[PDB]
Structures are given as C-alpha cells and as structure tokens.
From Swiss-Prot:
Source species, domain of life: Eukaryota
Name of the molecule in the record: Dynein heavy chain, cytoplasmic
Family to which the UniProt record says this protein belongs: Belongs to the dynein heavy chain family.
The organism of origin for this protein: Saccharomyces cerevisiae (strain ATCC 204508 / S288c)
Lineage, opening ranks: Eukaryota, Fungi, Dikarya, Ascomycota, Saccharomycotina
Subcellular location: Cytoplasm, Cytoskeleton
Function: Cytoplasmic dynein acts as a motor for the intracellular retrograde motility of vesicles and organelles along microtubules. Dynein has ATPase activity; the force-producing power stroke is thought to occur on release of ADP. Required to maintain uniform nuclear distribution in hyphae. May play an important role in the proper orientation of the mitotic spindle into the budding daughter cell yeast. Probably required for normal progression of the cell cycle.
Residues of the full protein shown: 3322 to 3391 of 4092
Domain notes: Dynein heavy chains probably consist of an N-terminal stem (which binds cargo and interacts with other dynein components), and the head or motor domain. The motor contains six tandemly-linked AAA domains in the head, which form a ring. A stalk-like structure (formed by two of the coiled coil domains) protrudes between AAA 4 and AAA 5 and terminates in a microtubule-binding site. A seventh domain may also contribute to this ring; it is not clear whether the N-terminus or the C-terminus forms this extra domain.
Quaternary state and interactors: The dynein complex consists of at least two heavy chains and a number of intermediate and light chains. Interacts with DYN3.
Misc. remarks from the entry: Present with 195 molecules/cell in log phase SD medium.
Length: 70
C-alpha cells in the first residue's frame, strides 16, 4: 500500500493545490479500500524516503519549514 501511495505521491502531486491534493489522496485511498489493498491513513513519504541527515543538509542550503516545499 505504501509503495502505490509513494508512486502516486512522487508522480501525480507536483502541480496540485493542497485542498485538491488531499481530496485526491482520500479518493485514491477510498478506491484502495474498494479494491481491498492494505494501506494505512497516516503514511508520509518523508517517513519512508527522506532521512534526517539529508533533511538537515537541505534545510541548511536555503529551504523553509513548509511541508509543501519539502
């Protein structure tokens, strides 16, 4: 479930505003429930790909604290 959410996150959600982004997340989660694959609700792609070392090394380079730019 996390890898299919990871794929849709890393591909689809570059040019989407946050309200419609959350709407599309919950829509695909609903479809996952309809087709019965085990995916959670509180998954974050940062929790699976971005390490704290790289996060610090990129925040020191001129990055803000907003999750959208992260």
């Amino acid at each position: 479930g996390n890898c299919i959410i990871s794929s849709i996150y890393e591909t689809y959600f570059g040019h989407l505003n946050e309200r419609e982004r959350g709407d599309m997340l919950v829509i695909l989660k609903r479809l996952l429930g309809k087709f019965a694959v085990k995916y959670d609700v509180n998954y974050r792609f940062i929790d699976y790909l971005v390490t704290l070392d790289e996060k610090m090394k990129w925040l020191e380079c001129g990055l803000d604290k907003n999750d959208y730019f992260l």
